[PDB]
Design a protein around this ligand. Structure first.
Ligand code: MG
Lengths: 35, 185, 258, 228, 267, 228, 59
């Protein structure tokens, strides 16, 4: 959600405001695993 | 001319690029022995370094307390960077233009320690700034360290014979500097 | 706690691991990448166009090229020079003379916190005027397009071709600002903060990504070329990284000890 | 029409406004980044990675251990994240871009000497006193932990969070006199007893990671003096 | 416990002081899907490129200072043959495919004795031009074999000397001060690393997946990883001990997806 | 009244704003267009129609086939939709009004020679190499397809979409050196064996259609130099 | 390895199939059937020379 406090109302849609990826077909996990 | 120069000035425009990292003590010992052999009061000398920032490491002075400390700052120099010799000459052309405000007739000699291997787009600017020191009545010698380019120094210097290698042009500059000190007042 | 740091993984421990103590509370989430990069900052200060300019020719530009510099803001945190993507950032320590002082830009607030390699986000460009009562406008053309550089005579007035187009030409009010959000338009999946490959546009410069940008904006004045003013007016480009995502942790710049 | 009375802060560009703005060139399907591994969710995934410190010997990530006995800390540096041993750590170079912190700095060591080098080291942490502790009898009373050298070769001394406030400042601006949160100090307890034909002066390689409860707050403008 | 033999194809390598495979950014970096930017059928792995390609690296004297690194470009070493690292059936397949999408798995061997001290920082460094001279030209083997360990100056710490487009004679050539492909030498441990200490191990084990700005990158241009061997503690030994310990490295491409078949690359 | 705080982009005319505006002269019932057949739903109904290319011989849609053997491609042109063999095709003149494309160009041929002309032709597609392929032994290794002349008289070589990015540029602005997506090249494999009393030099008529997956993106301002 | 216990070392055993020229370089036994033998606690390696032949019974 980022630095977005406008919790209530999105005037423009998702694909106009943001830019969604097109399809093809907290919990801080570590960036390196000893295996 | 026949009139003696009121002040004989000297510019050690020294290259501290990344390409003379392996030949910096060869450059320094050329300046350590031309600042010690000439302790005359009629000679003012400046130490100009350039790799990327053209830097006046010591201003044009003659008080031998400073030239002793000027050489003890050239020994603390680590090389590294590009080869901006067009800014090596802007730090001298800001000091020939200052010493023309005194109103004297000064024979300012530029000694240009260099590796010669300049970039093609930097040789346009290094020649263009050398010609702005040849508009101000200076004489540019290119002291060539081990392997250099003559044609890249035949345009920085005045002619193809003003270029000297460092093993030959040590005494050959003593045949020019001390030649004009007798020509001076 | 007895460990082996040659392993490369160290479990981050607390005071209770060695001693008697307890975990502190979670402070906040201001290190969140989608939150931390979501704030505006000054990118480049470009001069406002007044005629149909020639876009800067590709490098190496030779002398005698009658092109128009300092006009286009290539919207990128990476170092730029002459409105084109660069590899090194270079300012001018002693700018006396000598040629054309090339407009460089860098996002100072980004690279101090760009401890990663790849970065994708939208871009929220706000173009604040640096001139009183300036009535300007803001163009844009995407990553991969080029500037349309000519004019058409509209009623004996040389109206340029950068007044129109299928790309956003936002017109500012008198004394106002221009704010709009640009999507991730470039053909790369992510913008490389650090890149090591070679772009084969020229003699292949290592480390130069060709399409790491959100495009290129340019400010102009909505008058034809007969009404060209004299004093060159500036404008200031503030960008914000909306919906930031970042991959592959990397290094922060070297703070010198002197 | 709806009668609206706009506020006093109308037409104000604010750089950190928590809101969106008008889209200009939408309906752009970006190429997918599902192939990329290792996404940073949060920059506290990176303060926890131990990075090398640097020590005024000419800046060296390790502490040389001279064989001469003297009753003072071998290395000693304050626990303050503006101190110049933290400038090139991810603990320090991320937190100097912020204004506050909370949690435990974790100092990982690594004895990079020979395998036959036996020795013991008394790590410590003094809280801020009027005088920096120097004697081994003065780091005995502070938060110490003796580190033996053996098969393993790393010790992670966790500098605790002892503070009169829930978020300490991350930069010693004014004043903290040389005493903000006290001093880490690696004393040597027994001399390193080397067998014959082994190098004198082994090297303790220092790291600096963040704890599992190290949390940052309040972004500020950075220092742009890395580019000069 | 510490005796791990890593068989791959027909080239099994052994290590009796193994610290453990540092699988980077994921649990299993071997698992990877085909590129989404190629409509042609990709050339997957086969049993002559799934093996451990091994070549030497330069020796490590006492004269090597702190932070003097040594960089191996991957796949830049298979093509220039740095250190004798000849790919064989991999390089003869890499030259004929335009795009190449693989993840690496390296291992650096440098066997010290119990009477030596020192520590290398082997780290798969993403996206660096450390193999390239500042004048744009990539290093040749005659140029690597004269410096032997590229020392950490301030041009590498600042990124002052990364390769660049010359602006030409029109623009005044600016005083370059910084570039993003620097090394902060104190922060190389954020990368997938192990420390090759002189008292815990002889070999380190790093396993990294494919990363890149595109879902697959070109074959002759990419330097997406860089096997970086950095000296954190200088080698020291009493006299009589084995001077100049060798450094080798063994590289294995985990699941490559070649694309765009054409004839052999002729620049 | 409703207290509204209007944004920073107030009173900005934007040419591509995805919204309506105030109607001025509404309630106008337009006459119906149900009688008109053939409505264009989408302009990719028209890139798929094969239109004639043009070849530097004076611009000719066909390739003359000279009877003299020489080991080079008979016609060769790059697969770049700013190349001047595509200017007057609906593949090229629609896509030059855009910024990106994705999919397969489909090059349809037509042997307009006599019916008794037997021959074989090796079409090809090199991906971008450092050097344009010339030998028949060099288009044998690229994406080729041998075309025999027989009862039928057309071959539709489908130029594949081999690219490191999901949307290629539609205009060779800077740089692509002469090598953007490689080169189509029609080699002749066997010479055209004509019976006696038949015209020498038959003519292969070239078309250029779009694939069933050819898709365009990002409109730009056009080139108005058609009107000059 | 009948040397001392403190002797660390590594050995690259190999097996070339019959070529026109006997392999000599370490870069030439790298490509044949090799197996690297480390010296450690154990002190024996059993390299199994494979049976690669164009006939079921070699002379
Ligand atoms: Mg140089």
């Amino acid at each position: 959600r980022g630095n977005n406090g406008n919790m209530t109302f999105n005037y423009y849609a998702n694909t106009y405001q943001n830019s969604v990826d097109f399809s093809t077909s907290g919990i801080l996990n570590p960036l390196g695993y000893l295996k | 001319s026949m009139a003696c120069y009121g002040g004989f000035d000297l510019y050690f425009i020294l290259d501290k690029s990344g390409s003379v990292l392996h030949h910096w003590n060869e450059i320094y010992y050329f300046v350590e022995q031309l600042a010690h052999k000439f302790i005359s009061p009629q000679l003012r000398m400046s130490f100009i370094v350039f790799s990327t920032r053209g830097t006046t490491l010591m201003k044009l002075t003659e008080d031998r307390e400073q030239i002793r400390q000027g050489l003890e700052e050239l020994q603390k120099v680590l090389p590294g960077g590009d080869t901006y010799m067009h800014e090596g000459f802007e730090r001298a052309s800001e000091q020939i233009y200052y010493e023309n405000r005194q109103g004297y007739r000064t024979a300012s000699v530029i000694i240009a320690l260099t590796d010669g291997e300049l970039h093609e787009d930097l040789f346009f600017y290094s020649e263009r700034e050398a010609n702005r020191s040849r508009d101000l009545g200076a004489i540019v010698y290119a002291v060539g360290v081990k392997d250099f380019n003559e044609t890249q120094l035949a345009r920085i210097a005045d002619s193809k014979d003003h270029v000297f290698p460092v093993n030959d042009g040590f005494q050959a500059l003593q045949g020019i500097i001390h030649s004009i000190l007798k020509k001076s007042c | 706690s007895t460990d082996n740091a040659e392993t490369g993984v160290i479990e981050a421990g607390n005071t209770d691991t060695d001693f008697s103590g307890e975990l502190a509370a979670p402070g906040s989430n201001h290190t969140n990448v989608k939150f931390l990069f979501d704030r505006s900052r000054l990118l480049n200060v470009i001069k406002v166009l007044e005629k149909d300019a020639v876009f800067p020719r590709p490098f190496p530009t030779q002398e005698g090229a009658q092109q128009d510099d300092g006009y286009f803001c290539l919207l990128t945190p990476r170092p730029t020079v002459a409105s084109r993507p660069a590899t090194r950032f270079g300012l001018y320590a002693n700018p006396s003379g000598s040629g054309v002082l090339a407009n460089t830009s860098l996002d100072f607030n980004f690279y101090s916190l760009a401890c990663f390699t790849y970065f994708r986000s939208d871009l929220e460009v706000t173009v604040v005027s640096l001139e009183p009562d300036l009535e300007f406008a803001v163009g844009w053309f995407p990553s991969g397009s080029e500037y349309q550089a000519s004019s058409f005579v509209y009623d004996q007035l040389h109206v340029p071709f950068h007044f129109t187009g299928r790309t956003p030409r936002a017109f500012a009010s008198k004394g106002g600002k221009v704010s709009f959000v640009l999507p991730w338009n470039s053909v790369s999946s992510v913008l490389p903060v650090r890149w090591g490959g070679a772009s084969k546009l020229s003699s292949a410069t290592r480390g130069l990504p060709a399409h790491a940008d959100w495009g290129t904006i340019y400010a102009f004045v909505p008058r034809p070329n007969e009404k060209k003013s004299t004093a060159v007016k500036h404008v200031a480009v503030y960008i914000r990284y909306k919906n930031a995502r970042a991959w592959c942790p990397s290094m922060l710049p070297f703070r010198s000890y002197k | 029409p709806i009668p609206t009375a706009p506020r006093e802060n109308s037409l104000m560009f604010l750089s950190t406004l928590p809101d969106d703005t008008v889209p200009a060139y939408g309906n752009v399907r970006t190429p997918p980044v599902n192939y990329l591994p290792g996404e940073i969710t949060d920059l506290l995934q990176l303060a926890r990675i131990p990075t090398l410190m640097a020590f005024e010997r000419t800046y060296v990530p390790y502490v040389a251990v001279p064989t001469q006995f003297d009753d003072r800390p071998l290395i000693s540096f304050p626990i303050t994240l503006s101190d110049p041993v933290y400038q090139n750590t991810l603990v320090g170079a991320i937190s100097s871009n912020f204004a506050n912190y909370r949690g435990c700095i974790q100092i990982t060591l690594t004895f990079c000497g020979p395998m036959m080098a036996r020795g013991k080291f008394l790590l410590s942490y003094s809280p801020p006193n009027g005088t920096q502790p120097q004697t081994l009898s003065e780091a005995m009373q502070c938060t110490y932990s003796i580190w033996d050298i053996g098969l393993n070769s790393s010790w992670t001394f966790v500098v605790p969070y002892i503070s009169p406030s829930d978020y300490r400042e991350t930069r010693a601006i004014t004043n903290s006199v040389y005493s903000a949160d006290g001093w880490f100090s690696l004393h040597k307890l027994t001399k390193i007893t080397l067998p014959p034909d082994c190098p004198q002066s082994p090297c303790i390689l220092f790291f600096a990671s963040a704890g599992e409860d190290y949390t940052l707050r309040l972004p500020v403008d950075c220092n742009p003096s890395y580019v000069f | 416990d510490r005796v791990t033999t890593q068989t791959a194809g027909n080239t099994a390598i052994n290590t009796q002081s193994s610290l453990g495979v540092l699988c980077a950014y994921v649990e299993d970096p071997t698992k990877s899907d085909p590129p989404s930017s190629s409509t042609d059928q990709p050339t997957t792995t086969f049993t002559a490129i799934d093996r451990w390609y091994t070549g030497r690296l330069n020796s490590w004297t006492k004269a090597v200072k702190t932070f003097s690194f040594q960089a191996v470009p991957l796949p830049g070493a298979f093509l220039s043959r740095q250190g004798g690292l000849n790919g064989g059936a991999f390089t003869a397949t890499l030259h004929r495919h335009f795009l190449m999408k693989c993840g690496w798995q390296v291992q650096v061997q440098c066997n010290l004795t119990q009477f030596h001290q020192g520590a290398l920082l082997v780290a798969m460094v993403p996206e660096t031009t450390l193999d390239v001279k500042p004048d744009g030209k990539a290093k040749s083997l005659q140029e690597l074999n004269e410096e032997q360990w590229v020392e950490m100056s301030d041009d590498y710490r600042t990124g002052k000397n990364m390769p660049f487009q010359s602006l030409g004679t029109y623009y005044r050539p600016p005083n370059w001060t910084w570039g993003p492909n620097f090394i902060n030498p104190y922060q190389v441990t954020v990368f997938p690393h192990q420390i090759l200490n002189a008292r815990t191990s002889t070999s380190v084990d790093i396993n990294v997946p494919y990363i890149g700005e595109t879902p697959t990158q070109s074959s002759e241009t990419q330097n997406s990883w860089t096997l970086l061997v950095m000296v954190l503690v200088p080698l020291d030994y009493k006299e009589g001990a084995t001077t100049d310990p060798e450094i080798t490295f063994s590289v294995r491409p985990t699941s490559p997806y070649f694309n765009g078949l054409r004839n052999r690359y002729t620049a």
